[PDB]
Design a protein around this ligand. Structure first.
Ligand SMILES: Nc1ncnc2c1ncn2[C@@H]1O[C@H](COP(=O)(O)OP(=O)(O)O)[C@@H](O)[C@H]1O
Ligand SMILES: Nc1ncnc2c1ncn2[C@@H]1O[C@H](COP(=O)(O)OP(=O)(O)O)[C@H](O)[C@H]1O
Lengths: 300, 281
């Protein structure tokens, strides 16, 4: 059983010729509205892969709030710990170009009101893995890890979007999951390139600031893992339509792989499979693949 | 009055990929080049009508009642089965914008009644509606006996037919280049607008040039947000000519509105009132 603690966002999406550079006005088409948020996406990702999942976070007392909560319940995620909030739900401004590269700006809304006291112990009882991200306040992330350990869950921190982390969080996490910008933020010096070797060396560096399994995602180059092994796990070759929610599929698939009892080798392959499929359909949450697609792609 | 025919938009800590500016603002205000130009005239104490399409969504209502509360006649604003700008802004006033035309793409020639043009002194147009509707709006303006002000913005190619049918052709340095060829590195901007040519070429903090042959200096101000500077200038110029001011005093009156727009954040909210622009005289 997995608990996901994190954000619920309404995604407002535009197809664009080209992502605007600073100062640029670009013309877009095909305006669309879908439930999203790193938290809600990772919960739904676990559900479509057939894992049992609860979601703990806040929606606002607006139309979107109901749509965010109902969306989750419909996918069969347990929404008993989704709390109603004065003011607006989270909203996200997404642009996607023809290569599937995106640009996202998030208005936190009710996600900013998820405080430590909002975390009851019964949401964590009997869960094997707690899955956290950073579209909620850092004091809430600390409490979630604490309550997670107290219940005997593995703490999976997806440190995204990019944010500075205090030692208290980095030291209390079983697995730290970051993309290259998050890895560079926390380490200083980017991998302005890949060799898969370069981000292994940075994932070894991030390893120094804790005692977790460290996982670094590389988009079209897959992922690396510094922990009980130092290894690269290649991407599945697919046609990428919209890269939105691919880290969410991957995070959610890693969580459920470890929940179900898979080792890291298997769970990371499973996760690259799921993150690859998410690139091949448009939109965030709607692109989240189902167990049988993911298993098809693994079987080859 | 002045008739404005063009766009209405609602203008609305980031996954970077491709990259966003490090800055945290957006929320909700009426915008679009048409709406902004109309509100500009209204805030400058001018009688003004807005002609264009909103959607059947909450925004559509908000845009309409928004323009109304500023003092714009919205009678001719047609509901449609809204245009949206996703605006990201950093603390240094730098912007990234993604526009979804919505209803604005559905404003077709047969949408323009001649009633709306009757008695008006200036028809003010931009290029945020289909080109065939701009053509219609010009033709109906000429019929009603109005001066047709084309603001050829945003940057787009135009045929000789359209260029030859307007009484004033308002452009910036990128649009000037688009229609002619080769950016004015300045004057050379005045020799480019004569290659165009009444043609008005805006130059930011260097003000505006004219030839039908003169340059009108910028009002020096603290530029925090250059958004809606073109809209305030366009709206103000349109109001100076409909008020019967000379071209020289109107272009000074445009620069003065233009400069005051730069001094406050956002688009429609930064548009100066009359008392403000008259003080800067
Ligand atoms: N073009 C791609 N081809 C194959 N897999 C991809 C592609 N883009 C992303 N992925 C998968 O999704 C995961 C997340 O990619 P990445 O861009 O690092 O995440 P995020 O969207 O959080 O930045 C990768 O590890 C990989 O499994
Ligand atoms: N920094 C500035 N200082 C003074 N006046 C300015 C400044 N920026 C713009 N303006 C005024 O507002 C207008 C700005 O239009 P401009 O920046 O040339 O093109 P755009 O249509 O892209 O906004 C007029 O050109 C000018 O009078």
């Amino acid at each position: 059983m997995i608990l996901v603690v994190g954000s619920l966002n309404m995604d407002l999406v535009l197809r664009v010729k080209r992502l605007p550079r600073p100062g640029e006005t670009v013309l877009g088409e095909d305006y669309q509205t879908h439930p999203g948020g790193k938290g809600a996406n990772q919960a739904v990702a676990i559900a479509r892969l057939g894992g049992k999942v609860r979601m703990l976070g806040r929606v606002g007392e607006d139309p979107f709030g109901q749509a965010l909560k109902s969306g989750l319940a419909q996918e069969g995620v347990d929404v008993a710990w989704v709390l109603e909030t004065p003011g607006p739900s989270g909203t996200a401004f997404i642009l996607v170009d023809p290569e599937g590269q995106n640009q996202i700006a998030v208005a936190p809304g009710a996600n900013a009101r998820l405080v430590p006291e909002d975390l009851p112990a019964t949401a964590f009882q009997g869960v094997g893995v707690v899955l956290l991200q950073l579209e909620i306040p850092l004091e809430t992330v600390v409490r979630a890890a604490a309550l997670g350990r107290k219940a005997g869950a593995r703490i999976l921190l997806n440190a995204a979007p990019a944010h500075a982390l205090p030692s208290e969080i980095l030291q209390s996490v079983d697995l730290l999951l970051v993309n290259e910008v998050e890895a560079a933020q926390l380490t200083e010096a980017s991998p302005p390139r890949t060799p898969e070797e370069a981000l292994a060396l940075a994932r070894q560096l991030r390893g120094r600031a804790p005692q977790a399994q460290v996982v670094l995602t590389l988009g079209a180059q897959g992922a690396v893992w510094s922990g009980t092994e130092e290894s690269h796990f290649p991407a599945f070759p697919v046609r990428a339509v919209d890269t939105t929610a691919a880290g969410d599929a991957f995070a959610g698939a890693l969580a459920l792989g470890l929940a179900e009892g898979q080792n890291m080798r298997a769970a990371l392959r499973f996760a690259n499979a799921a993150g690859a499929l998410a690139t091949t359909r448009p939109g965030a949450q709607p692109s989240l693949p189902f167990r049988d697609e993911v298993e098809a792609l693994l079987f080859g």
